[PDB]
Amino acid sequence: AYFTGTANNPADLLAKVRVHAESLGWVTDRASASEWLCHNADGYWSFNAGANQFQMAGNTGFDNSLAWNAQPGNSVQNNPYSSKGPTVAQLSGGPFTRYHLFATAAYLHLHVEIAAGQFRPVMIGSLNKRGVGYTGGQYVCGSFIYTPGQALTNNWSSHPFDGYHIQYSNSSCMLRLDGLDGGPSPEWLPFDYTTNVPRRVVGPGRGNYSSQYHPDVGLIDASANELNSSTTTVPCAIYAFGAQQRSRYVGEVPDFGICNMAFLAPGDPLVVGSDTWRVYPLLQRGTATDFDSTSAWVGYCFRVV
Amino acid sequence: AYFTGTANNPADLLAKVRVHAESLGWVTDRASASEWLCHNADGYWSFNAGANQFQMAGNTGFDNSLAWNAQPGNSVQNNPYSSKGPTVAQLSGGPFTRYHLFATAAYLHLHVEIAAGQFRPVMIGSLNKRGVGYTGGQYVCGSFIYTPGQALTNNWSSHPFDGYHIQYSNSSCMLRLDGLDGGPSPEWLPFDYTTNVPRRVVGPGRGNYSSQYHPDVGLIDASANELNSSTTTVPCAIYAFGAQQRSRYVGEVPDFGICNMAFLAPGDPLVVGSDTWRVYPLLQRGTATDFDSTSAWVGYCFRVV
Amino acid sequence: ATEFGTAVNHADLVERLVQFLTASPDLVAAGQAYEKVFDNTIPASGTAIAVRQVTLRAPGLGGTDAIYMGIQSYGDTALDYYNLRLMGGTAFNPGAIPPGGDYWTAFANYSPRVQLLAWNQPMPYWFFANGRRFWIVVKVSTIYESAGAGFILPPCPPSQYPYPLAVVGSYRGDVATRWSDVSDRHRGISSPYERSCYLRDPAGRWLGFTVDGGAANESDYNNRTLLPLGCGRYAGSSDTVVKQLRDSFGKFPLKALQFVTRETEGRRYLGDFDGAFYVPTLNSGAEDVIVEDGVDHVVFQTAWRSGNPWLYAIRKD
Amino acid sequence: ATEFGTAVNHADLVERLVQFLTASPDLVAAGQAYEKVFDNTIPASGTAIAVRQVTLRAPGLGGTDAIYMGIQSYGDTALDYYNLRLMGGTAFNPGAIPPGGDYWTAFANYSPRVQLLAWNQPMPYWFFANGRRFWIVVKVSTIYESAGAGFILPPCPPSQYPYPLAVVGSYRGDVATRWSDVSDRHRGISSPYERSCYLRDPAGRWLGFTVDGGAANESDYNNRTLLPLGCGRYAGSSDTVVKQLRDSFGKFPLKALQFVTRETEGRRYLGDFDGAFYVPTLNSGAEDVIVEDGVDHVVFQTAWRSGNPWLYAIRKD
């Protein structure tokens, strides 16, 4: 359920997380030191480990004779982007201080502390349908950094479930929504807002950025209570846009919420109800208005079981 | 301690209050059906009952051969006023709904409901020295009405302990302060502000009137708490102005407070501590801003024993 | 707990409401019926309809809460309106009524009044009530009028915040208005504007919430708004997802309405409407009933316009 | 609980303050000593003095309360101010300090800082402390300066309002100042001005109080003031009784200081200063001691001037 450890290189994280997944019962169609083609009862995913980053891509079928980024129904070719690039998570090429892994039969969440105050979360899983009848819902997210030294959370940067980013080559996260507007079933909608594409998805990823497009940004802003120092979990709703510019609620991320870290430390416990919550910063804590050099006080909450 | 009754004429109240005072040990030097010359261990007072009003005056010595308003050291001749008028309490024809009487060995307080919603307070006693060394301190107050039908609480009106009034003939209340600024011991300081007389006294009498001169007016305004609907007692501090506009705090009114009735009815109880409080309106309840036709919500919180 | 019908006039409506509150089978069986502590008609009507004043007591679901409301009926024949006013408080005291004036001032922590617009005629109605809150909806031709009050559900224990009283109405009760008005200030519960929704701050302060700013309104309330319909604060464009929300394969998503305040001093989250949710408009409308997990919800729209951001659904249980 | 002495410098002054809070015979015997939950020096001093950060916890008289406070010693040699910043809160969390930045933000329900002005040279001092509040006064040559924080005494049971925390200082802590300032904003506790006294509302909202209004200050705080020195709200003349207050036959009357808020929403009485009163200036001044009912009181004057409104006394026990 909850695991911790250390890793000098990304390959060590890769090895330990595959060990954990196999121990849990995850089905790995192909396994290698750097390339995976795994799947579960929900969907298919493929991952590749680079020198200082991870490359992720969705999948719908298997073919061992094809490359890691050429599986049937791959997201590289089945996306509105003209660049045709897969998901990317930009990590470091050095010793990672620590990581925290949440493993389940339906989703996998990873939070890696590459260095003191530096964190790189990775999310894979499927959204809770909540009784809504739709095919797909598999989401794969990565962490991207624009430029070290300069504004780390600049406008061009992209984050998991982001709702406002500027980039023409790569996307930090992506979502699957099959059979939208009568199109072919294989559809891998990315998180973009400025491309004006007929079909796209948006999320509260960035948290409380100035130009974030989501109605719950205020809820995340007020997650902290000045009265009793109490914090509440806000469901992370995902919205999708159709050809006719008519939005449709699609669901929420299982066992995941956002809250302000204005009055809590990384990993501080606050048990709300019978369930227990683990809260860690997205990238790096700063001040309230430090939306350029760090991630401000946006906190990722995971339900620990 | 606490008495109630009815009186068809002012003479009835006269008889009942003298009976109560005598039963409580008060010493009456001379008594009659309409005139009084009484005293106690604190001071001397004289009262006269008119057709529809009471005439009161302080005293320092006794002389049975002198009229009711001609006793030694009488306030009529020993006051800065050029008119040389005694204290006056203006009432109605005599029909009284009820009267509430508070009697003690040191002070006497009366509140008569002349008619439905009409109340007239009468005050006699001495201020609590509170360790302050001064001779005198006896106070006698009455209730005066400017004109029925028109603005009842007009500027020209005067009230017990009033801090703002316009009148050249009569005063609603007085206060004794002997030997002020090296003058002769017999000195009866009236409650006036606009005469610019070298020596005068002021009080919170009017309550929370717009042009009321007292620093606690805010305390009276905020006496009612919106948090728990709780009400507190505010001591009725009195101020005396010296020969050259130098004020000297003199004391507080015993067993008396002035309190807001925004959220309370006449006579409702609100026990604060081991002591119990009785609250009855000054003249007549109105709205918040009705400072002309009625007495707004100024309240007289007393201690009942 | 729910009642649908037609009242021959505004008076008929008010005694229908009181009988529903005091004799509904669920209310009486569960011991949740409300108690009438005051009922008078003080004014001498001239060229106006008789004014009925009612104040009722409320125990709440647990029976340990003390909740007090007030209801007034006010109308004028010359202008042809029969406004019904509402207010709340924490204590009542009949003797605290001045000669003349009015009685609503006697309420402890008295709050400005809200009102519902109607007139003397057969009006279809909808009643929703519970031990902690009540909701009123009236169908006026093509216009739907609504209001209500009760307790919100804060995420904090009731021990330290036992009085989360909220009062909401279509229009401010400080002035008399005719139901035929077409001004934008006249709207529903989901979108308060110009003193249309008051809530008791844990500090006993009736803070007003407005989804949109207004010069006439006090500057204090501009910083506290209803986020779900007030997404414009952060969005850099007039058109946002909320205005373009639509069903998903025939399923109507129900979105909770939140209370939030963000001033210089601090931030806090207060609670959520109990039984009120926002829903889209396309391919739907008022009077519509949607079933989600076995509980039905009715659909209603604001009088001003029937647009996407001015349409809400209310749980009927 | 009381200590009179001379601290060789600001660092030694804070040192003596902490030793007084720890080992004072009254505090230790009664078990009212505070606990130090944090003490660090994060910054790398350049052309400035070392910065000391301290966070302490007070249990209160009954031992069931939770009080958190922080003290900072910020100075700049090239400008020669050794300011001592103060602030309060309800909880602390050392891990909530961001890389860089500061730690005072980690406080739960953080409040703007107040401060104390002095510099590195021997300085007479007057320290008053109790389980619920503390007072600091330093005689800076021609200037008397003072500050403090603690719990006020509301008239309501502590069951529902257990955190009446108040912080007051001579000047706002948002800017750096030289103790030779010539602005009217630099004054004492009895009369705050321009964010000089903050009080935590029962709704967890830090409400500042100012005796006199100010365009720079927020509009909300104008209507809430300290009545004793704010008599000008109702008086129709510049000269009032309070300005002309004087002793009576050698007896100096002590007047309690007041907290009151009169807003549009409602009114409420918050509490009084514990151990601070208003007294006149005539035939008296600073370093004066007056005994009332066997209890002594010291006399201090504001930095601005020693005028009648600009003077207050502190109980010494």
Numbering used by the authors:
A (entry chain m), B (entry chain S): 2 to 306
C (entry chain k), D (entry chain c): 2 to 318
Would you copy out the relevant sentences from the publication that reported this structure?
Bacteriophage Casadabanvirus JBD30, from the order Caudoviricetes, is a temperate phage that infects the bacterium Pseudomonas aeruginosa. The virion of bacteriophage JBD30 is composed of an icosahedral capsid, long flexible non-contractile tail, and a baseplate. Using its baseplate, JBD30 attaches to Pseudomonas aeruginosa via the bacterial type IV pilus, whose subsequent retraction brings the phage to the bacterial cell surface.
Reconstructions of the whole JBD30 baseplate and its parts enabled us to assemble a composite map that combines the localized reconstructions of the baseplate core, receptor binding proteins, and tail fibres. The bacteriophage JBD30 baseplate is composed of a trimer of distal tail proteins, three tail fibres—each composed of three heterodimers of gp47 and gp48 subunits, three upper baseplate proteins, a trimer of baseplate hub proteins, and three trimers of receptor binding proteins. The upper baseplate proteins together with the distal tail proteins form attachment sites for the tail fibres composed of three gp47 and gp48 heterodimers. Three tail fibres resembling bent arms protrude laterally from the baseplate. The baseplate of JBD30 is terminated by a tripod formed by three trimers of receptor binding proteins (gp54). The interior of most of the tail tube is occupied by a trimer of tape measure proteins (gp46). However, the cryo-EM density in the tail channel is not well resolved, except for the part in the baseplate core. The resolved density enabled building of the structure of the 33 C-terminal residues of the tape measure protein, which form a coiled coil. Residues Lys1149, Arg1151, and Gln1152 interact with Ser59, Asp61, Ser64, and Gln66 from domain I of the upper baseplate protein, and thus position the C-terminus of the tape measure protein in the middle of the tube. Methionines 1130 and 1134 from the C-terminal domain of the three tape measure proteins coordinate a putative ion positioned on the tail axis.
